Design a protein around this ligand. Structure first.
Ligand code: HEM
Ligand code: HEM
Lengths: 145, 145
């Protein structure tokens, strides 16, 4: 249940999400591309789904990948801004879930993003505590897939 | 080209875009839904394109419409944040252009959003100068359609 998953975002979890996002969200282009390139590097079997972006190994040099990566960061900005209202968080999560359901992305494969998130957080000196908080937000999307 | 249309946005236009967005963008849910409902009220012929959202006359109560409307406002937030780097603006504009090209939305049809934009701006006392500024930004997307 997406509603039960959303209920897992307690005061402490929301605080950790906000605190880490203040830093990570300050460079959407840089960290967004870092998140994607890490996903492709550690989970090569997911590259096939991104055929529209072309040669993803080009990283920042690939215009389609950069446009996609920046936009992905605004989806996370959206989630963070809706943390105060569960009903609004759920409706935006369901909107993005559809974007992935149509691409045949399962809850299990969506969850592969947790590894890259932990690595990007770690590079900014945010440890397991923060990685786990983000895993709980990702779990809300998984509940909708 | 799209780059030409983006590189043409002047300092004054960018200032008017940012000043009006500071206000309109501060209530993404309220103004996002108002923008969409106004589009449907004045251009009823576009309703059919949004069948995925269900009964759009339900307004704020329609969770699918609310989720879509909030997300649309973050696409605009994205555009506003990339104003000083045409290269970044172009790659995000092209990303969203694809989202509309796949739905067979022509450049002329996309321009139908200018009427609703003018009305939403007017609700907060932003006049024709501001509506003209926004039409120039919409024109950047039209260059990609
Ligand atoms: C933090 C997690 C993630 C977020 C917030 C997210 C967000 C997004 C957004 C905003 C889009 C654009 C939707 C559209 O315009 O249609 C997108 C596209 C896509 N996502 Fe994700 N995504 C995430 C993780 C993943 C993962 C882990 C996979 C695959 C295992 C995945 C697969 C896709 C695919 C295949 C596309 C389509 C790309 C294209 O052809 O343009 N996403 N995602
Ligand atoms: C300020 C201008 C506009 C912006 C920023 C914008 C933004 C968006 C965004 C972000 C989406 C979601 C894309 C996706 O997830 O696949 C969307 C979907 C869509 N847009 Fe727009 N849009 C605008 C104007 C228009 C206009 C004027 C029309 C039609 C006359 C239009 C028709 C559509 C349709 C049919 C969808 C698909 C809805 C669905 O089934 O989920 N858009 N738009």
């Amino acid at each position: 249940s997406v509603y039960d998953a959303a209920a897992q975002l307690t005061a402490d979890v929301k605080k950790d999400l906000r605190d880490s996002w203040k830093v990570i969200g300050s460079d959407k282009k840089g960290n967004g591309v870092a998140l994607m390139t890490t996903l492709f590097a550690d989970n090569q079997e997911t590259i096939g789904y991104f055929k529209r972006l072309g040669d993803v190994s080009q990283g920042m040099a690939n215009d389609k990948l950069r446009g996609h990566s920046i936009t992905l960061m605004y989806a996370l900005q959206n989630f963070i801004d809706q943390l105060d209202n569960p009903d609004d968080l759920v409706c935006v999560v369901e909107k993005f879930a559809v974007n992935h359901i149509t691409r045949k992305i399962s809850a299990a494969e969506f969850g592969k993003i947790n590894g890259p998130i932990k690595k990007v957080l770690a590079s900014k000196n945010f440890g397991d505590k923060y990685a786990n908080a983000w895993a709980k937000l990702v779990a809300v999307v998984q509940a909708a897939l």
